[PDB]
Amino acid sequence: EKRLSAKKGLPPGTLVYTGKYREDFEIEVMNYSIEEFREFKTTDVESVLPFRDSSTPTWINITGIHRTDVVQRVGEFFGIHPLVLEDILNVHQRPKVEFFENYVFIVLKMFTYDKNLHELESEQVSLILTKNCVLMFQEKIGDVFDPVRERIRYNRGIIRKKRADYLLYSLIDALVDDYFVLLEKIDDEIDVLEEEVLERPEKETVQRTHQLKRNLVELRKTIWPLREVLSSLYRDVPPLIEKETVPYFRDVYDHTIQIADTVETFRDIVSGLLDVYLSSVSNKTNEVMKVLTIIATIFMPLTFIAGIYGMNFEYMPELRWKWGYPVVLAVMGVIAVIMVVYFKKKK
Amino acid sequence: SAKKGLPPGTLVYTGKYREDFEIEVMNYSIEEFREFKTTDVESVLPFRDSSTPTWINITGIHRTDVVQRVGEFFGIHPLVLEDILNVHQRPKVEFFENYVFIVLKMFTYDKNLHELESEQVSLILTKNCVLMFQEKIGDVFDPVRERIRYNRGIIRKKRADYLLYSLIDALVDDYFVLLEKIDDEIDVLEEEVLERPEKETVQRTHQLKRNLVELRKTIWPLREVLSSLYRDVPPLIEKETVPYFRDVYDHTIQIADTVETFRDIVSGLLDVYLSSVSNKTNEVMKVLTIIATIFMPLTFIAGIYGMNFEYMPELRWKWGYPVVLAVMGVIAVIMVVYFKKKK
Amino acid sequence: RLSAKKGLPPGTLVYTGKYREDFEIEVMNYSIEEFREFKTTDVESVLPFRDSSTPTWINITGIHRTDVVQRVGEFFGIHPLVLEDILNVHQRPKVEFFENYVFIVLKMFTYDKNLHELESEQVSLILTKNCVLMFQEKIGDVFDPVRERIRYNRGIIRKKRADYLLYSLIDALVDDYFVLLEKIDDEIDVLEEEVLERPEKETVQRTHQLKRNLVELRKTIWPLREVLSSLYRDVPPLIEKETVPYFRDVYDHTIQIADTVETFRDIVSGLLDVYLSSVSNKTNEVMKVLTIIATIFMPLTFIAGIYGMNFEYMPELRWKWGYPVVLAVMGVIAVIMVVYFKKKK
Amino acid sequence: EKRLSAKKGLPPGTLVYTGKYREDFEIEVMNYSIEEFREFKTTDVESVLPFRDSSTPTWINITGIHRTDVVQRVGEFFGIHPLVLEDILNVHQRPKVEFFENYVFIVLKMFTYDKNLHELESEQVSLILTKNCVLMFQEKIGDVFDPVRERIRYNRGIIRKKRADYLLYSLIDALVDDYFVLLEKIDDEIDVLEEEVLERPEKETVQRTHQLKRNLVELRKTIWPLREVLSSLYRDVPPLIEKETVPYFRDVYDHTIQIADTVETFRDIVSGLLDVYLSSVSNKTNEVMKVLTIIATIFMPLTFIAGIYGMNFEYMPELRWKWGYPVVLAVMGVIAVIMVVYFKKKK
Amino acid sequence: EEKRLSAKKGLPPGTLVYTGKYREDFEIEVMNYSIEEFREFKTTDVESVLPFRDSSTPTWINITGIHRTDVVQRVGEFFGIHPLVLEDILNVHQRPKVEFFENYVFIVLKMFTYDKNLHELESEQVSLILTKNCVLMFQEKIGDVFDPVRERIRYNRGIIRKKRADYLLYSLIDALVDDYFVLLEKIDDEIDVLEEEVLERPEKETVQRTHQLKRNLVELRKTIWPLREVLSSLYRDVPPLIEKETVPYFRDVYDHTIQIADTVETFRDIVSGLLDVYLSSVSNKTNEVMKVLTIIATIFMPLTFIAGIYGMNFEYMPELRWKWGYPVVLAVMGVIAVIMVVYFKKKK
Ligand SMILES: CCCCCCCCCCCCO[C@@H]1O[C@H](CO)[C@@H](O[C@H]2O[C@H](CO)[C@@H](O)[C@H](O)[C@H]2O)[C@H](O)[C@H]1O
Ligand SMILES: CCCCCCCCCCCCO[C@@H]1O[C@H](CO)[C@@H](O[C@H]2O[C@H](CO)[C@@H](O)[C@H](O)[C@H]2O)[C@H](O)[C@H]1O
Ligand SMILES: [Cl-]
Ligand SMILES: [Cl-]
Ligand SMILES: [Cl-]
Ligand SMILES: [Cl-]
Ligand SMILES: [Cl-]
Ligand SMILES: [Cl-]
Ligand SMILES: [Cl-]
Ligand SMILES: [Cl-]
Ligand SMILES: [Mg+2]
Ligand SMILES: [Mg+2]
Ligand SMILES: [Mg+2]
Ligand SMILES: [Mg+2]
Ligand SMILES: [Mg+2]
Ligand SMILES: [Mg+2]
Ligand SMILES: [Mg+2]
Ligand SMILES: [Mg+2]
Ligand SMILES: [Mg+2]
Ligand SMILES: [Mg+2]
Ligand SMILES: [Mg+2]
């Protein structure tokens, strides 16, 4: 209803941004050949539009898809189907490839993990590969893509030698790689949490356990498709040159499996955290209940006799007598002493 | 859940909705549009033979004679019409030579008392018509009606199969709304489960589980109905409508992701609460334990010196018990010190 | 009684089930123009119907008479493995295919409410030429409505052939399951009500019985779904454009049941964890009462037991305005132990 | 006595018996056809070597494969691969069916169950179908094949009319039949066990349920390859006479499924047995609390007032107007009785 | 508990970077052999092994200490190994695999070492490349399971000397897969000891060990599953692996691996209940602690109140004055104590 999960009743072609980031808008362009390169930014689309006809590889990054107007304008110019456009704009959706005639279309998820308050956020990056362009579409400023920029700029690696497909591999290889980062953060979280779980009895322990479990589920929900998307890229290939670029997506495929597995491992672990915790607590109850028993179980028989020697009659034998009070205190010290002897097994 | 012993062709509305019956009909082509309502079935019949798209919506299928009649007129096999009127059944598609047959489920989720309801929606695509069969009045189809009416979208331009698409599409899109609500209820529940120790909570928890089960049982085959429509297409215009069906599938893959997601999420809730309440039990134990461990030994010396004995001064010595009182105070001091490793 | 008949050759004919009670053969030969039906204990009398040109339903009941299964089978030309398959009632439902005939094993269920339990009886069907052969363990069945349909000519059955009678028999036999499931659905409803609102061990027990019975149900129903999958997708002596879509309809109910049998499994599966939580909570709130009485009364008996001391020259007895204030302070700490207790109780 | 799971360092054909039984060695032969049959035992492997070339089905039962010379001889004569000989000797393994050029190889297990102290042992059985011979290999004297022996002697059934592949069939069907016996015993154990769990709270119970869980896991591991074992015997069939022996293989294969389902039915039943125990313990903990609390909650407050009225004070007596003792005992009984009243709901 | 080696990022596709924890050893071994004779040697000079690319006879070249990525790059370029394959030899956090190429088979496998006492398992990654007449082996660290295979080559044991490079690769992976037998045995011992502990030893360190075992099992499954797939691909495809000879051998290894994997899922099946068996014991001791607490509580508290109503200072109240009251109250108190014990004769 409000800013989550619903644009409803709108026709099949409606361009609407569903995410939260309306802040920034910036349009980056990097063109390159083996010979030379150029880069620029701008806030005007009419400058970048002519690159669709380029003979040389081009990476056009639109940050600020919160502007539906520029997404549309570009979609139209490169001839992107309106359903596809709409997918780019609706950022709540699963990861996918859709191959078309003159183009490939890809929807990926970048993540961010804040430790301290433990939570994750996800930005949607959409890539379109057509002709010589990779069109990028982001929500906000910030991204994992920088090493690629450096690779182009400082001529490191093979990127300069290759055409646009290997560039889509470059952007996808970065995006996938940052998941390892997120995963390191998360195993750190796991270790911390199992320490806390066996050794540190509070309820905030439970709260954090649960938080990690959800963060893990959302992680997987985005992850398994992400694996299939790479899986598809590997087995089909309409404009992705074979004998050059194929083993490159394939290495991103092995990554997305190594990752898909790692979150599984994570899951099987975190599931039994809470069991370990129940085992910590009901074991802590056991030791308390043992203390209260020996405390109660010594003083309960004693307070009884001390109460039968405080009873008022007349006619009573042992009150006058006497020799009693030392013999009574004797029997008391004796019975509590055989209690403590009886407890040489327990605690 | 039982109509038994009846012949294969027997029309029995098996639903719980007995109240309303209505017939809505919209005939459109590119240049013009015409809509009407009625309770008279024959009046909507001549539309079987037209060369333009028409949406014929029969609400209140508890009236069987209408279903029989319309069926016989459009030439639909009695096994289908029975299927239409038996509303406990899974979403499927049957592909036929002169038509397609589709059963789907709309859901409804009441907050306050938290519960869900289902309507069964049937669709026949034949020649130039979409035949829609609803159990009761009101639907998620209002934006579609508004679209045909107001020439929004491409819908006016298009044909009967694309009308189908818009109908099913609207249906599927509503689940999004339902998911948002379930999400909210889940938020509330987990808040309460870690912070609010009550049995009404375990109930609400189990009910949410049960609901997620019913929802899953519907959602999963729904994924499959679109799976065919996208992949099969005998009288469905290819180059035009196949990509659009492909969308509704995408979404219905999504809805099924979110639902497993919820099941995974809720499935650990009862272990939270168990872990939470097993802790609060432990931390009230401590309180009862300290209260028992100081005040039990103390009440013990109070009982010695209340004993009535002919021997034993105190009696005399007349100091008190500053010293009884002081030994109490000192052993209490050390008990509490001992409990500086605890509460 | 029992689960092993062993050391025996593959052909050997043995009834493994528990009911030796009844024996009866019922025959209905019916055509478009007319119909006739009779019963008997005499086997040579039904044999000639092999060559009848019209639909016959031979329901042989009391398979515990092995010699009749032998007779009829050898006569109609049914293999020895199929005959033994008819006499062994411990087995999974299956469909096997052959030249002149189709072999079918199904299960009818009876669930007693009150004392909650289920028993099964096995029906074997053989469709051969114009005859459909039926085999039961004991008197009574789910098939009366198709009998009624044949006697009174209701619906399309009189027009059509023998494999349509297969269709109808099976359909009836599948439809039973719906009512079964309704019953089991009731059991589940009461059982969960009890589980959250009613902490006893008998409810542990019934939860277990329900889980078990549900297991049995899944185990019968799942191959049963695979049965009508095969009758729908294969079809050699089954008239296609006429019967095959009637076949698909049972195929569809067979599926609906299976999903429902799952829903019940998934729901039963949690019913223990809801019980554990109610008991724990119940265990908690039982503990809280113990403490609050202790923590207000235990320190109370202590300061109330100081002034029961027989020491002379307390002096503190000297306050003898005294006791009401001595009573007061008690209540005060008592109250402040209660005033410890009006948050979190 | 049962060499552990490893013989390593050894090259691939190394023929080593890894089991515990060295005790007996015997060889039994039955040559038969429609007309007649001859049967004999022996310790001499030379006299059973000629039967490889038999026109008519022979059954060679070698018992005592600890004698590895024998297995080597026989193996080399009938043309069996060193890897399969090795497989006949190493008894820690899964069942399999390997189809070769001139012969069929099966390994299968023959279980034995001890009730009382509950545990299961398994002898290996190896079967090689070659030409007209069934080669059969056993660790120890005693087996399940005695009634197939009897059908060969007393000419019961159709076995004499039929061939070597039918011999194979009979043997496998006796194996498979025995797992029913086994399952019956496990069902008995299961019933006693669940009954003891729900009505009988002791620890040797958990010990037993666990024993069973494990035993069923073992039985699963032996049976599931087996289901696939007779699956591949049913669906393939190069030298297995089709129109004769095939519907008989499918018969064993139906059995094999009932056995597995009977296993899976058991598993899902046992995995609930511990949760039954869990819920019985936690109701006992509750029911003990209940008893502690009604005693604590009626008497501790009644002790508080008896209590103030025993105090010896300067203004003592506070009351001493004789009314007025029994009024206190009255209000004692009244607050106790209304404690019971308040407990007339649950406890 | 800090930044772990996982991410090699910002780095190009071909980047050769060792991600392991072993920097210690470096050694290059060679055995070359034929039916007539063989030569074995070590060296740190890579250029001396290189000519073996062109040998007619099978040559196993073991390169221990892949941390030196110049050696790894050398042998790679010289053998025409594609940079991505090279990089995989170098990156050790990754699942076992086969990849087949025009001129070589790349394989990734894993050796596991378990230590008892403090219970923990380390792995080492092994790479193998079937290329022409060579198998290139790459190890992180000295020591390995391939000793008997060397021993066979040296002293002419088995058939290995007659067969070729493909059978040499069979021999290597067979010794590898065969290690997992030992490993599963050790994990079994720990399992028995640990379930005994779970029932009969109520300590928190027991819990620590149960969870530790569980984690070890998961890391062990994660590797062990595709290990199965690696041998399956190897059985069923076979481009330069001589078929009618070497395929059955590869099949055998596949078999043990199916066994290996089955076992691993059985251990998992057991350790998953191991913690519920603990929590059963614990609740049960406390259960039988609370009993003790409650039966001591319920006999004396009705007794301490009977002792309360007695003194208790009031007038009238015989009771006190008729004598006989004290002993008769020892009788009542006593008898009610004995009927509490009698009611508790359904308990202990
Ligand atoms: C030297 C003085 C001579 C006085 C007259 C002698 C008469 C002979 C009597 C036999 C002696 C036994 O006397 C015995 O004393 C003991 C305690 O002293 C009493 O026992 C008394 O105190 C014990 C405490 O241990 C209580 O458990 C018991 O309920 C109470 O009756 C016995 O009830 C009485 O039978
Ligand atoms: C002082 C003389 C030195 C020589 C030693 C002998 C001293 C006397 C020994 C006393 C033996 C104690 O054994 C016994 O104890 C109980 C207290 O539980 C006393 O008192 C008991 O009397 C009878 C038992 O029959 C009961 O009615 C009463 O309830 C009970 O208290 C008995 O009178 C005494 O016989
Ligand atoms: Cl690059
Ligand atoms: Cl009919
Ligand atoms: Cl119906
Ligand atoms: Cl049988
Ligand atoms: Cl071996
Ligand atoms: Cl036989
Ligand atoms: Cl890498
Ligand atoms: Cl060798
Ligand atoms: Mg849409
Ligand atoms: Mg790689
Ligand atoms: Mg019906
Ligand atoms: Mg879309
Ligand atoms: Mg006093
Ligand atoms: Mg049999
Ligand atoms: Mg059979
Ligand atoms: Mg139908
Ligand atoms: Mg070996
Ligand atoms: Mg082997
Ligand atoms: Mg890389």
Author numbering:
A (entry chain A), D (entry chain C): 3 to 349
B (entry chain D): 7 to 349
C (entry chain E): 5 to 349
E (entry chain B): 2 to 349
The authors write:
Mg2+ and Co2+ are essential ions for all organisms. In conclusion, CorA transports its substrate in a partially hydrated form.
When the intracellular Co2+ concentration is increased, it will bind to the M2 site.
